Structures are given as C-alpha cells and as structure tokens.
Write a protein that binds this ligand. Sequence first.
Ligand code: HEM
Ligand code: HEM
Lengths: 362, 353
Amino acid sequence: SSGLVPRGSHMESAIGEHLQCPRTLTRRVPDTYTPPFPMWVGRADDALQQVVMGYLGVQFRDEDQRPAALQAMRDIVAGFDLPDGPAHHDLTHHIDNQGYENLIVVGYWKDVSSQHRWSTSTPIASWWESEDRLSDGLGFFREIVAPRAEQFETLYAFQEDLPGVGAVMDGISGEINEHGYWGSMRERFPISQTDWMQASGELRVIAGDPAVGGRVVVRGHDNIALIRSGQDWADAEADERSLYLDEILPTLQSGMDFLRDNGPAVGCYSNRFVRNIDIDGNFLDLSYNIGHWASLDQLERWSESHPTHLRIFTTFFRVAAGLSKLRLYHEVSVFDAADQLYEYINCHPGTGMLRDAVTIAE
Amino acid sequence: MESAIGEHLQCPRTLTRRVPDTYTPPFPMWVGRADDALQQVVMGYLGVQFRDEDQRPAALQAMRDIVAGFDLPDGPAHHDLTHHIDNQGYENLIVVGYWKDVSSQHRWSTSTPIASWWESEDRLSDGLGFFREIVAPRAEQFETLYAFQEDLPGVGAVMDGISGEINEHGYWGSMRERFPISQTDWMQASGELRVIAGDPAVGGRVVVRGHDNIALIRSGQDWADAEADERSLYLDEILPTLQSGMDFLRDNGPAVGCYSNRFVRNIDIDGNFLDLSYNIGHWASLDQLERWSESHPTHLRIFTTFFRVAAGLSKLRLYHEVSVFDAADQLYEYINCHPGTGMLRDAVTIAEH
Ligand code: HEM
Ligand code: HEM
C-alpha cells in the first residue's frame, strides 16, 4: 500500500481534502510521478474560506522625507494591534525604477469580514481618509486582494515558521506530489480542477486621475494573478549565504529588473523586488518579489522561458539535495474583480496598478 | 489554428491540455501529416560496430550489404546512414529504415536473403558487432515537430505531407499533447528492460525485450544549406551547447532514465560525412524525457542559446520525432557488441527482476 516514504499516487496532494473534486482539467504527469526533492504547502480546513492580503505602502523621493516615512510606517503597524487587525505582517523596502523609496507593510487576514471591519473602524478609516495624508508630502497606497481558498496556492522548500500567507494557515502538509514540473503551480490551485482561471476585463480607474496625484482608485479585473516569491538566508551558514548572494541573487536581480522595466511587453502590471526591514527601517536578510500579472498564463510563459528564471530554477534542482538553512518559497493567487482594491494617495503615475490602468474615460 | 493531431485521430478527450484552447504560440512550427492509411510505422535501426581502424573496410562493406538489402521487395520507404564513436571508443555505422506498415517489415525480415544474412554463423566470425533495434509505434503513439516546411527527414519522410502552423508547441508539456494518444492515455511506463537470451558480458548473440512505453527521440540538426555566417552561429554557438547535453546523457544515462544516447552524423554510402546530425535517445519513460528537457541545465542551456541567436538563423533545419511503444512492438538484438551498446547497458538479467 503506502510505504514508509510514500511515492506516486500515495503522496499527499497540494489540494486540501475539503477542496478536492474529480478533475475535469487533468494533470500532465502520470500516476507514478514522484518529485526529486521535497516541497510542502500550507494547510487550512474549511474555516478558511477567503483570506485577505493587504499591501500598505508609504512612498517618498527625498532623503529628508525618510523620518516622516518611517513614522507613517510605524503608525500603520500600530494600527495592526487594534481589533480585527491582521494575524501576521512583515515590513519591506525597495527603490523603484523612478528612484522613489517605498516602504510596504503586508498584512494577512484569515477572514474578509474581519479586514472590512478593521478598515472601516474609526482609528483606521480616520487615518486613511485624513487630510494629513495629503499634507504629509508622502505617497500612500493600499493594494488589498482577497482570494478564496480555491484561488491560491503555496509552496515551501521548508516546514517550520512559514512566512507570508502560510503564517495564517493552520499548519503544513506532508511532502506533496504536484510540484517539480512546469504546469504544477496551476495544478496546485484547487480551482484548477475545473476552471481555466482565464483573465477577462481591464484594469480601470474608477476615481481620480493617475497623472495628477491626489487620491486614485483602480478596479482590478477577473483573474489578475499575484505572486509573492521569497528568499530567506538570515540563519544560513556561510556557504549557503554565498550560494544565495553570489550564485542566485545576481541572476534573480537581472530577472526582477527585466520585469520591472519591461512589464507591458510580458503582461506584468507591477514588479517589485523588496528587502525585509525591521521597525526602524534597517535591512534584514530576507527578500521577495511582489508581482501583479495580467493573467496567470503570462506569468507561466515568463517563468518557463526567460533565461534568468531558468538559470535559478536549475540551480535549485542542483542544490536541492544538500540544502539545509536557505529558505525559498512562493505563494500565488488569482482574484475576482470585486475582490481587489487598489488605492493610491499622491503616488507617482508609475506606482503599482496606476501605470497600466485605463483612465476614467479611456 | 491547426492541431498537431490528425483529423482522423481526434477523439472525445478524457485528458486535457495544460493550456486553454485560446493559446497562441509565439513562433511558427509544423508537423507531419498522414491519413488513415498510416496505422503503424516501423523504425528499424540496423547497426555495424567496430573497434579498430583495420576493420573499417569490412564494416563499410557490411553497411553497403545492409543498404542493398533495403532495395529488395518490402524494403523500407526511406532510409538514412550515420556514424558515431561511442564512449567505449567503438565506431558505429547505423542504417535507419522507415516502413509505413508492420506487415511489410515482417515480410522483409523473414525473406530468405535478409533472414539468412542475419541468422548466419558468418555474423559471429566477421569480428564486427551487429545490431537491430526495431520499434513500431502506432499512429497515435508518435509526434513530430519541424521548424521548416519541406523535405521532411526521418519518419516525416514516410508521411503524406506537412501541416500548416500548429497550436500545440512552445511550452513545456506541448510534446505530450502532440501525441494523439494523450487525448485519453498517460503513456505511463511499466515493466523492465530485460535480457531474454544470452549475456551482454559474454558477447555472441543477445536479445533484449523492451517494456511498455519506452520512449525514443530522434532530434536532428541539418546545416547543409547554411551559408558562412549561419554556419558560424550553428557550429560555434549552438553546437557546443548541444555537444554538452549529448555528452551528459551518454555518460549519465541511468541517473536521468536514458537507456541509450547516441549523437550521430549522417554519412553517404562511402562513409563520408554530410552536414546533418541527430540524437537517437531511448528513454525509460516519456516523462523522464520531459523532465530532462524542461529542467536539466544542459537542455535549458541549448534552449536559451537557441533563442539568443535565432534572429541570425534562416537555413538551419531543426526537428524532432518522439515515439512510445508497447512491449510487443520492440525488438533489440545484438551480435558481438560490447556490453555498453544500446539496450545492453541497462537491461536486467532474468534473475535480477
Ligand atoms: C531565489 C529565486 C528563485 C528560485 C531559486 C526559483 C526556482 C524555482 C523552482 C525550483 C520552481 C519549481 C518549484 C517546484 O515545483 O518544485 C519554480 C517555480 C516557479 N517560479 Fe521560481 N524561483 C525563484 C524566484 C522566482 C520569482 C521571483 C518568480 C516571479 C515571477 C518566479 C516564478 C515562478 C513561477 C511562476 C513558478 C511555477 C512554474 C510552474 O509550476 O508552472 N520564481 N521556481
Ligand atoms: C541544437 C539542438 C536543439 C535545440 C536548438 C533545441 C531547442 C528546443 C526548443 C526550442 C524546444 C521547444 C519546441 C517548441 O515546443 O516549440 C525543444 C523541445 C524539446 N527538446 Fe530540444 N533542442 C535541441 C536538441 C534536443 C535534443 C538532442 C533532445 C534529446 C533529448 C531534446 C529534447 C527535447 C524535448 C523532449 C522537447 C519537448 C519539450 C516539451 O514540449 O515538453 N532537444 N527543444
């Protein structure tokens, strides 16, 4: 039956038991398929219906704005302690291709109604709506997206202390079957059992004007995809730190720069390559991509063809056997139009979903 | 757009593709077409092996003898000739013949001039190694892919013509989808590659039986029409990456599920080289071949190098054919070959399975 070390059809599935159904869209590997290295996925029971991933940002241009920016980031984080705040968060920094610095606090909620109560609560809404946000001279944004349980997948190359959305799930799976081949990401989405997750519609400005600053609201469209793909080398030994910093990162950086600067050509609305920071703005040894894509298909096409991702993909297969403390993972999600809110205050026109959004009158 | 799967071979699907029906490939490719008359083909690879330079005249005469046999009634519809030196330093002349049906190849093999030659005691006293690796995929059990639309080599030479631009290519997993049987069947491998007569370690006559869904790839390169600048791109940029991958599979086959990897150059009847080459690769399963092509750094380096230089290409002809077979539709026979030859290397003895 099932051995000590299960293989093929005896291995666990990425798809939670309560979300399984007979596949009308079938897998691309035979029943005997057994991956060459272990990967695990986040588990949650049926109580997790729909999560919220809220990326809350503070943007600035000049050195003399850094104190005000850090103060604002700290105020956002303080707001997380209030009732209905997110169950997990982390803080990051990056400089965008227009030279603006961006601090982003990402929060994860286990329930949509909870996030909505938090956002509407007086302390939070008064801060977000305040005229102070305009007089601050800083840019702010909220890119808040809510995939149902069937609409996201996770993959971790480790088992303990899961970052991102894994932190708000119940626990970790055993070693899963649906990984190690192109097309496996799609297969890991429970909705993939029956649905092609095809994009339709257009990113559209529904309030304000990206070109002139002030307050701007962009509506998403069906099956925009969001990838968070991360690297953590903080506790690794010197040799694994070198593997990452010297052998992986320069190529990863090249690929991230490519998506950042060639987005419209490949279907990437926004690409950010961010470094974790502490509450004081100082760098930590963790990083990740935050990538918003016009479709899951376009993300698939890029990942399986661009030389940068192919090189690092192949490095991982090589070092997989010996990996001890270097931590790599991703989470990918798709969303209905109604389950996405992209709001900007005094951000430059290239920020996030402002860049490719169809203006209020085309 | 046109489908890789012939109209008569399209059926109600129980297994789906990995892309939606709206997928559009980023560059054109074409496939071989044949109607319902082509039911099952035979690919017969007939080899002559030798170690020492003084055996070359006898080896070449043997090759000419085999080719003359191809001219008899029920001989193959198409053939080509190749040379390579294997990782044991032996030279190998291989004549591949393609037949459009199983019965004709059987009539041919059992016909007195052919059977008498293969069964002769002379084969044991020639000092040469001889082999026959003969496999017969049904129409639903092979796929082709050509980056050109004329004079198809290999199995394409025995099909009826060429398609228009096809939908099912340009993403990993597209090869599987070009097999008509993928509409309903995983082409899962089962069974063992097994010695059923003789002992590879001892020589003489050895017979190996295949297993269900062994896969065979012939992936080819033809630069015979290239002018100087394009020859440089192929020989100086592409070929070193191809060479690296071929060396890898030749020398690390068990690790990735490749039973046999040959990288061969076409020759004319005199044994002189032509500017065409191909891989002949036998694999333990179609999915092991898929894993190598899509995740091994060797093929990925070939892939990326190709796209880096592609804008300077025009006359270079690249193609492949891949087949899977039932156990019964494979025959691997060796006479006085070294123990690493073809299916002899990895085949297990009767008591080892
Ligand atoms: C340290 C950096 C990275 C490494 C070493 C790496 C490596 C890999 C590996 C080994 C896989 C296959 C996982 C499995 O199924 O077992 C994979 C999948 C994937 N990666 Fe990355 N990756 C990195 C960063 C990224 C980034 C920043 C992106 C953003 C576009 C990306 C996009 C993808 C996608 C879309 C897949 C799924 C492919 C599929 O299953 O169809 N990766 N990556
Ligand atoms: C210079 C020689 C080669 C070049 C430039 C090259 C390039 C490529 C390209 C561009 C593709 C994707 C084709 C498409 O779908 O449009 C491909 C697919 C493939 N190649 Fe190669 N290749 C070469 C040699 C080989 C060889 C010798 C092998 C033998 C194992 C091989 C095995 C494969 C396989 C199995 C696929 C199918 C992948 C799939 O669709 O799942 N290739 N190759």
